[PDB]
Amino acid sequence: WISPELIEILLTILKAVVILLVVVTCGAFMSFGERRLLGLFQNRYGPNRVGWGGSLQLVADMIKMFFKEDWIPKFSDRVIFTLAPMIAFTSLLLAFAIVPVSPGWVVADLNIGILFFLMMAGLAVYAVLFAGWSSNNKYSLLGAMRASAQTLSYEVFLGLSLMGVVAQAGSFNMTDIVNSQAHVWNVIPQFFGFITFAIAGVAVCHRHPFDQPEAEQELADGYHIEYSGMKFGLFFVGEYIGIVTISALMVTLFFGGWQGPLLPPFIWFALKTAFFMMMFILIRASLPRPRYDQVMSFGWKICLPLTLINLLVTAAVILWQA
Amino acid sequence: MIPLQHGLILAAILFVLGLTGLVIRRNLLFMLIGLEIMINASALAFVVAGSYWGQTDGQVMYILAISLAAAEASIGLALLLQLHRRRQNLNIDSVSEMRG
């Protein structure tokens, strides 16, 4: 089995496996990082005792989550109940599989690209829907209805917010998208696409301020009330992986991806992705939660016309300069 | 090297399955689901035909097909809402008082 083609195949497979393991590790260590960064933003420390600087807090949480009683309620639809954390873990991981983290480091150089991300987000809503319905809990059903309402709010304009970047690159492929930002990052021309994608991508992960399915103050944590043990941990690890994926996609589409003047390309990609991960934490710490009817009104009356007008203006600019 | 006949046969199987579901189900929601299966099978047949000829027209007809499917599902859900509001049941045999 000594051939350049085969060893290139295993090299690509090994690079994909490394990307997958690093993304899952970043989700778990960013549960820990959310705790530490919230401590930083709130003039405190967060977990800094278990290990050096709290570095073993994630290990202790993982051991506790594994040896917790992982139960399935007798009143629940058992197969759907077990299936919902699997969807929550896998959907935005698969969405990460199109992110080019470096030249030569991408799992899937798909022709559809950002279309595959839209596919995975549209699949990702069903995790919360199935968790809310199957658990046979009133608060969880209210959370599932709120999650569907949220999906109505953002999915109408998420892809349209990406369409200006798609129009400028002339392609759905994400490597072409980062190559079209060789001179100017897309946050400058596609600024309105950037803010609408920021809103819709925060709403994709059901992160605060769009945590209405899991609203603690209203629904007492909502759709995942009956979950415990590693199914609950699956929901939150999938949420943090979704934060990682949305931040990396924001970097890839609007901030040049890995392109930068001095540092190695992965250093630039990791720095920008870490900045937007921190921004996820900071907006969780900073701003209050709107009512979900107000969120639906904002998505349908403000964001969607903004994305349509942005696409029209972007096309007029492109055809004027061609 | 997929034969065109195999794709057409798969689309025909899905079409007749959706038609059977439309006939044998009294619930209006399952009838709408069978209608969705029918139109999706016809759109799959168009995609197969477009891929055999190497033409974009198969996917263009697919796009028009799912636009019709979306608007038809919208109208069917509105009518199902009216049937549930005005009958408290989704039995399609109950709405049969015009005859002869």
Partner: protein, 298 residues
Amino acid sequence: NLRRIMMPQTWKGHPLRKDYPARATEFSPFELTKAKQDLEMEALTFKPEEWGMKRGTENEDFMFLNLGPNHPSAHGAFRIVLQLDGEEIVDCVPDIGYHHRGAEKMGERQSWHSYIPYTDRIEYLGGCVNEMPYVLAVEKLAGITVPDRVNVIRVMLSELFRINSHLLYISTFIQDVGAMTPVFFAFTDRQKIYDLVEAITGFRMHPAWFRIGGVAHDLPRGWDRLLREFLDWMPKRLASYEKAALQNTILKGRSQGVAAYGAKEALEWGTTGAGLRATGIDFDVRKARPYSGYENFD
């Protein structure tokens, strides 16, 4: 609907009667059995027919939801039973009595002096504010006119605990609206107040420090240093809370126009304090019926 409101439905007797025994040790110790647990859990279960509520319309069913006693937004042992049409509240029944401590019955059970710590725990974020009307009413019974220094000490402790309670209230409102950060800083401000309050009274939450005829001790040497430190610390923190949270338009959209009532509704329900004065009725006890030397402050 003349049913019990403090005691469970399967309660025998009327506890504020003079022949009803006060102490729990008069009766058998609490023995939770399976039959008793099933009985009192049946008695706690909401019955919508007893409150004139239907189970739904013809088109849809109403969801009867327990908002409490264990809910993050219920401020204690407190249940509201929500009749929900989707997310709309058709009607609600607030179910109280889960925090009944028999404090009035205990008032008949303790001496005039030994009852003061119970007055502290009537409104447990209030402290010396709760002590003040009791000691003033006892001093009316005793024919006592306290000196001016007592009046100023009691006013200062009352205003410190009013700031403590208001800090908790504002931060928890912001937390309930959705922004969780200002509660950390506001409890730091509460710790500055508690530095002064611990130094003066020896205790944080329930000082039990007012006395019939005065206060328990003189002010310790160096209290003014702690008061000056808190008065320097507070206003920048409060301005930061205002700008960061209370002037955020999402918080305004969550709160402005929400659960609104006017002067007539405030008067007919006995609403006092900030709700009544929010209706425009300028009624504060410290101005209308001045007590404890509050007339000497501007």
